[PDB]
Design an enzyme around this catalytic site. Structure first.
Site, mmCIF file in Angstrom:
data_model
loop_
_atom_site.group_PDB
_atom_site.id
_atom_site.type_symbol
_atom_site.label_atom_id
_atom_site.label_comp_id
_atom_site.label_asym_id
_atom_site.label_seq_id
_atom_site.Cartn_x
_atom_site.Cartn_y
_atom_site.Cartn_z
ATOM 1 N N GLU A 29 31.253 -8.252 91.626
ATOM 2 C CA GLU A 29 30.800 -8.935 92.658
ATOM 3 C C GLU A 29 31.091 -10.108 92.914
ATOM 4 O O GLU A 29 31.726 -10.428 94.104
ATOM 5 C CB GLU A 29 29.148 -8.704 92.746
ATOM 6 C CG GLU A 29 28.620 -8.811 94.123
ATOM 7 C CD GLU A 29 27.168 -9.014 93.982
ATOM 8 O OE1 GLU A 29 26.425 -8.654 92.868
ATOM 9 O OE2 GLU A 29 26.476 -9.398 95.186
ATOM 10 N N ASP A 48 24.212 -15.588 101.516
ATOM 11 C CA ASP A 48 22.610 -15.601 101.219
ATOM 12 C C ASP A 48 22.129 -16.918 101.126
ATOM 13 O O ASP A 48 21.280 -17.296 101.589
ATOM 14 C CB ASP A 48 22.342 -14.647 100.138
ATOM 15 C CG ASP A 48 22.431 -13.153 100.389
ATOM 16 O OD1 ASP A 48 23.205 -12.893 101.100
ATOM 17 O OD2 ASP A 48 21.738 -12.397 99.515
HETATM 18 C C1 LIG Z 1 15.344 -5.289 95.614
HETATM 19 C C2 LIG Z 1 16.615 -6.090 95.421
HETATM 20 C C3 LIG Z 1 17.050 -7.145 96.245
HETATM 21 C C4 LIG Z 1 18.219 -7.964 96.066
HETATM 22 N N1 LIG Z 1 18.741 -8.748 96.842
HETATM 23 C C5 LIG Z 1 19.944 -9.365 97.245
HETATM 24 C C6 LIG Z 1 20.709 -8.195 97.770
HETATM 25 C C7 LIG Z 1 20.282 -7.181 98.535
HETATM 26 C C8 LIG Z 1 21.175 -6.083 98.900
HETATM 27 C C9 LIG Z 1 22.582 -6.066 98.678
HETATM 28 C C10 LIG Z 1 23.175 -7.107 97.904
HETATM 29 C C11 LIG Z 1 24.812 -7.371 97.889
HETATM 30 N N2 LIG Z 1 25.426 -7.983 98.781
HETATM 31 C C12 LIG Z 1 24.880 -9.346 98.758
HETATM 32 C C13 LIG Z 1 25.728 -10.151 99.588
HETATM 33 O O1 LIG Z 1 25.298 -11.618 99.745
HETATM 34 C C14 LIG Z 1 25.822 -9.708 100.960
HETATM 35 O O2 LIG Z 1 26.887 -10.678 101.684
HETATM 36 C C15 LIG Z 1 26.301 -8.318 101.086
HETATM 37 O O3 LIG Z 1 26.335 -7.898 102.437
HETATM 38 C C16 LIG Z 1 25.301 -7.625 100.120
HETATM 39 C C17 LIG Z 1 25.922 -6.029 100.056
HETATM 40 O O4 LIG Z 1 27.093 -6.063 99.358
HETATM 41 C C18 LIG Z 1 22.403 -8.047 97.395
HETATM 42 C C19 LIG Z 1 19.023 -7.521 95.147
HETATM 43 C C20 LIG Z 1 18.634 -6.508 94.223
HETATM 44 C C21 LIG Z 1 19.470 -6.055 93.005
HETATM 45 N N3 LIG Z 1 19.640 -4.796 92.408
HETATM 46 C C22 LIG Z 1 20.434 -4.314 91.608
HETATM 47 C C23 LIG Z 1 21.249 -5.333 90.969
HETATM 48 C C24 LIG Z 1 21.243 -6.871 91.333
HETATM 49 N N4 LIG Z 1 20.265 -6.981 92.429
HETATM 50 C C25 LIG Z 1 17.633 -5.704 94.289
#
Ligand SMILES: Cc1cc(NCc2cccc(CN3C[C@H](O)[C@@H](O)[C@H](O)[C@H]3CO)c2)cc(-c2ncccn2)c1
Length: 765
Positions: A735, A538
Site C-alpha cells: 500500500e 485520510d
Molecule cells: C473497518 C476498516 C476501516 C479502515 N479504514 C481505512 C480504509 C478503509 C477503506 C479502504 C482503505 C484503503 N485506502 C485508503 C486510502 O487512504 C484511500 O485513499 C483509498 O481510496 C482506500 C482504498 O484503497 C482504508 C481500514 C480497515 C482495514 N482492513 C484491513 C487491513 C487494514 N485496514 C478496516
C-alpha cells in the site's frame, strides 16, 4: 457501428473469474445467474478441516502468497496460490472459448502439488461449489452409475433465460483417492467423488462456507445417530465426506478427497455454441492465451532503461496481471443515508458534532439493486470499487485494452444519481457487506472523492485525436465509435462537475477574502477533527479546527482537472456555449489558486482557513497537498511558482527520500504522528502524478527543462526500484513504502495503484 461494437464487447467480456474476493470462482456479468467457487483444505484430525479450509482471500502467516501470473479478461489467465498452512502450491488456469449467442464457453484446470514440507500422504479435501439464482432457471446433476458416488465425470445440466442451455462438467481428475476399510464404507462407499444437490432461497446462495458446513455437520450427526463412535471411528477424511445425493437444485456441492498431488478440470459448454468443450480444448486454449499475453505485453509495456532486463519484465507482468486480474462483477443493494439532514451542510463552526448527531438518527436504508464492473485495490482487504482509486487502476488497463477501460468507466457512471453523486465506496449486495463492519457501510450523498476517472478520459481523448485484439481498440480505431461514446457520457460528466460546484463550494463572499473570482473556492465536506477521508488523503494535516471557512487547494485543483477535460470533450462534440463557460471557469481557477492558496513566504500552495478574528489565513503543511496544482497539470512550464515547487520536490530535507517523495515533510510538525497514514510514507499514486508531470516539463523547451529531466530520471528509478526490491523480497505490492528504510508497509496485495509502476517503467508519457 457503435451498437455493433457494444454487442461484441458485451459478448466478449460476459464471462470471467469475476469474484476476486475469493481465491478462485467464476460468474458472468449478470446479477442473478450461475456462480462457481473452489475450496480446499488438508484434513489431519476430526476437528481441523473447519480451520484449514480456504475460500475467501486473506493474507496472514499461513499463506505465502498468491496472484495472477498472467491475465486478460477477454481470454483468461493463470493464478498461483502458495499455501503454507495446507502445504500446497495450487495453479488455477481459466480460459474462455467464444461461440454461440450467450457469451461463449469456458474451462478451468485446478492443479495441486504438495510442497516439500507436507506429509507425502496428506489428505486434501477439494470442493467445487455451484449455485444458480433466478426464478425460472434449472440445474440438475446427472446421477452416477455407481452406488455411492462417481467413478468418473460429474455432469450438471442447466438452463436459464440469460445463458440458454448449458452443461458444466467436473472431470474425474488425476491423483490418489484414499480408500477406507471401515464398516462405514458398506453404507458410504470406500471413498469416491460425491455430489449434493440442494435448494435454499436465492438470496443466501453466496454463503458457500456455512452451506457446506451445515451439510458436513448433518453427515456427522448421522454417524453419531447410527452408532459410529470413538470406540472405532471412521478415518477423519471419511467422516468429512458427504453422502452422495445428486438431483436438481440451485446449489450443487461437488466434493473430492485426494491423497498427495491432484488435478481436475471444470468444463462449461454453452449449448448455443455447438460442440462441447473438452480437456484437450482447455490445454490448447491455455497455451494460446499465454502466447498472446506475452506478445501484447512486449508491445504495450515495453520497459525502458534501466528496467529492460528479464527480472523487471517478470516484475512488470506480475504487477500488471494482479491489477487487471482484480476485476470483479458486483451486484446488489447498497446502504445510503438519503435523509439530506441539514447538519450535513456543515455551515456552522463545530459542524462535525452536528453531522455526527444526524448520522446517529440512522436513517440510512438499502437501495438499488446496482451493478458494477470494476478493478479493486485489494483482494484480501478491500475487494470492491473505490472511486478515486479506479482512475489510477485504469491508466495501465487503458494501455492494455482501451475498450475494457471505457466499459469500466461506463459502469461507474451508470451508478450516478439524479443530482450528480457517485458513492466513493461501492459495497453492492450481502456478499460485499459481509466483509465490512456495519458502522462503515453507509454512504453519504454529500461525500465526494477525487475525480481521477477524468485522467483516463484525458488519455482516451489524446488517443482518439492522434478479433479480441480488434475489439480491444475498436473505440479509438473507429473515430465515430469513440465519439458516440463521449456523446453519451458527456452529460454525466457535466452533471458531476455541476455537483462538485453545488455541494463542495467554499465561502469567499462571507469573509474578508479578496480574489480575482468571487465564485471559485472549494471545501471537502465530511471532515472530522483529525481526518478528511473524502479527499483520499485520510489523515493529511488540514486547518485546525475544521471550519466552514476552510478552502482546500487539492479540491480546487481537481475542479481544474475536470474543467480541462470538459473543454476537450465539449470541443469534440461542438458544445460551443459549454466550452465558453468552461473556459471562463478555468481562467478563474488559475487566478484564484494564486489569490487564495499561494504562499510567497513558504514558496508553495496551502489550504486556507478563517482566523479567530474572522480573517483569511494560509495553513501550510509541506507535502503532497502543497504540490497539487503541479501534480494535476495546471501550472505553465515557465511559471516561477513551478520553479519553487521543483525546489521543494527535490529537497532531501523536505519531501525527497531515496525511495520516493514523502507524503509529508520531515520538517512538518505532524511528520510521523498519530496513525501516520499520509504523514510521511511514500505513496505510488501521487509519485506517479509527479513523475508524469516532471516528464512533461522535461520534454518541452523552458527554464526548468533540465531540472525536471534530472528529477524525472531519479524519481522514476527510486520509485520503480523500491517497489521492485520489496516485491523481489516479499512477493507483494504494498500500500505504501517507508521513506527511512524503504520497506513496504500497511497492507499487502495492493494492486491497487501500486501497479502504476508498470507504466512508470514503460515511460514515454
Ligand atoms: C473497518 C476498516 C476501516 C479502515 N479504514 C481505512 C480504509 C478503509 C477503506 C479502504 C482503505 C484503503 N485506502 C485508503 C486510502 O487512504 C484511500 O485513499 C483509498 O481510496 C482506500 C482504498 O484503497 C482504508 C481500514 C480497515 C482495514 N482492513 C484491513 C487491513 C487494514 N485496514 C478496516
Amino acid at each position: 457501428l457503435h451498437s455493433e461494437i457494444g454487442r461484441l464487447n458485451n459478448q466478449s467480456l460476459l464471462w470471467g473469474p469475476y469474484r476476486p474476493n475469493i481465491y478462485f470462482g467464476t460468474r458472468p456479468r449478470i446479477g442473478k445467474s450461475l456462480m462457481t467457487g473452489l475450496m480446499w483444505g488438508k484434513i489431519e484430525s476430526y476437528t481441523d478441516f473447519q480451520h484449514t479450509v480456504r475460500y475467501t482471500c486473506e493474507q496472514n502467516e499461513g499463506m505465502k502468497g498468491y496472484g495472477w501470473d498472467e491475465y486478460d479478461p477477454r481470454r483468461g489467465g493463470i493464478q498461483s496460490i502458495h499455501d503454507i498452512q495446507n502445504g500446497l502450491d495450487i495453479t488455477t488456469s481459466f480460459v474462455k472459448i467464444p461461440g454461440g449467442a450467450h457469451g461463449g464457453s469456458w474451462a478451468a484446470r485446478i492443479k495441486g502439488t504438495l510442497n516439500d514440507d507436507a506429509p507425502k500422504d496428506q489428505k486434501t479435501i477439494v470442493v467445487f461449489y455451484v449455485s444458480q439464482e433466478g426464478e425460472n432457471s434449472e440445474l440438475e446433476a446427472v446421477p452416477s452409475e455407481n452406488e455411492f458416488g462417481y467413478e468418473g465425470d460429474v455432469i450438471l445440466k442447466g438452463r436459464s433465460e440469460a445463458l440458454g442451455n448449458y452443461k458444466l462438467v467436473v472431470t474425474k481428475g488425476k491423483g490418489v483417492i484414499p480408500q477406507s476399510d471401515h464398516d462405514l464404507s458398506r453404507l458410504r462407499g470406500p471413498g469416491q467423488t460425491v455430489v449434493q444437490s440442494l435448494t435454499y432461497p436465492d438470496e443466501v446462495l453466496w454463503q458457500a462456507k456455512p452451506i457446506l458446513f451445515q451439510q458436513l455437520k448433518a453427515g456427522i450427526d448421522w454417524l453419531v445417530e447410527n452408532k459410529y463412535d470413538v470406540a472405532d471411528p471412521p478415518p477423519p477424511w471419511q467422516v468429512y465426506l458427504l453422502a452422495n445425493k445428486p438431483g436438481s437444485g440451485n446449489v450443487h456441492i461437488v466434493q473430492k478427497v485426494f491423497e498427495g498431488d491432484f488435478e481436475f478440470d471444470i468444463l462449461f459448454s454453452s449449448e448455443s455454441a455447438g460442440k462441447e468443450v473438452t480437456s484437450k480444448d482447455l490445454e490448447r486454449e491455455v497455451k494460446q492465451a499465454t502466447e498472446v499475453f506475452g506478445e501484447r505485453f512486449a508491445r504495450v509495456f515495453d520497459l525502458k532503461a534501466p528496467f529492460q532486463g528479464d527480472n523487471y519484465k517478470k516484475f512488470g507482468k506480475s504487477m500488471f496481471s494482479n491489477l487487471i486480474g482484480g476485476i470483479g462483477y458486483f451486484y446488489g443493494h447498497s446502504l445510503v443515508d438519503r435523509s439530506y439532514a441539514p447538519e450535513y451542510d456543515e455551515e456552522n463552526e463545530g459542524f462535525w458534532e452536528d453531522a455526527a448527531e444526524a448520522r446517529a438518527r440512522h436513517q440510512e436504508a438499502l437501495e438499488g439493486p446496482y451493478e458494477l464492473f470494476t478493478s479493486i485495490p485489494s483482494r484480501p482487504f478491500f475487494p470492491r470499487g473505490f472511486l478515486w482509486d479506479e482512475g489510477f487502476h485504469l491508466l495501465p488497463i487503458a494501455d492494455w485494452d482501451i475498450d475494457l477501460a471505457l466499459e469500466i468507466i461506463k459502469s461507474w457512471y451508470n451508478l450516478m444519481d439524479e443530482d450528480g453523486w457517485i458513492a466513493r465506496e461501492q459495497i453492492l449486495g450481502a456478499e460485499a457487506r459481509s466483509k465490512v463492519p456495519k458502522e462503515f457501510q453507509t454512504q453519504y450523498p454529500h461525500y465526494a472523492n477525487p475525480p481521477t476517472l477524468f485522467l483516463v478520459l484525458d488519455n482516451f481523448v489524446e488517443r482518439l485525436r492522434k478479433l479480441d485484439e480488434t475489439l480491444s481498440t475498436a473505440s479509438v480505431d473507429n473515430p465515430e465509435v469513440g465519439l458516440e461514446y463521449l456523446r453519451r457520457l458527456y452529460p454525466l460528466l457535466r452533471r458531476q462537475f455541476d455537483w462538485f460546484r453545488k455541494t463542495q463550494a467554499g465561502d469567499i463572499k462571507s469573509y474578508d477574502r479578496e480574489a480575482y473570482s468571487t465564485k471559485e473556492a472549494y471545501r471537502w465536506r465530511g471532515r472530522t477533527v483529525s481526518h478528511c477521508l473524502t479527499s483520499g488523503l485520510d489523515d493529511y494535516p488540514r486547518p485546525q479546527p475544521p471550519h466552514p471557512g476552510e478552502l482546500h487547494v487539492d479540491l480546487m485543483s481537481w475542479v481544474g482537472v475536470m474543467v480541462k477535460s470538459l473543454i476537450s470533450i465539449g470541443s469534440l462534440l461542438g458544445a460551443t456555449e459549454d466550452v465558453e463557460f468552461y473556459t471562463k471557469v478555468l481562467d478563474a481557477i488559475e487566478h484564484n489558486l494564486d489569490d487564495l492558496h499561494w504562499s510567497e513566504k513558504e514558496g508553495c500552495y496551502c489550504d486556507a482557513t478563517i482566523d479567530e478574528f474572522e480573517e483569511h489565513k494560509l495553513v501550510c503543511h509541506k507535502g503532497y497537498i502543497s504540490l497539487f496544482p503541479f501534480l494535476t497539470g495546471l501550472l505553465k512550464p515557465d511559471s516561477p511558482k513551478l520553479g519553487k515547487l521543483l525546489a521543494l520536490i527535490g529537497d532531501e530535507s523536505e519531501l525527497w527520500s531515496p525511495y520516493g517523495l514523502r507524503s509529508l515533510s520531515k520538517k512538518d510538525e505532524f511528520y510521523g504522528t498519530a496513525e501516520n497514514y499520509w504523514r510521511s510514507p511514500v505513496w505510488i499514486n501521487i509519485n506517479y502524478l509527479a513523475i508524469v508531470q516532471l516528464y512533461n516539463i522535461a520534454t518541452q523547451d523552458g527554464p526548468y527543462k533540465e531540472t525536471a529531466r534530472d528529477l524525472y530520471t531519479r524519481l522514476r528509478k527510486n520509485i520503480v526500484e523500491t517497489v521492485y526490491r520489496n516485491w523481489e523480497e516479499t512477493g507483494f505490492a504494498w500500500e505504501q513504502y517507508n521513506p527511512e528504510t524503504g520497506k513496504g508497509q500497511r497492507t499487502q496485495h495492493f494492486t491497487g495503484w501500486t501497479s502504476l509502476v508498470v507504466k512508470i517503467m514503460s515511460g514515454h508519457h
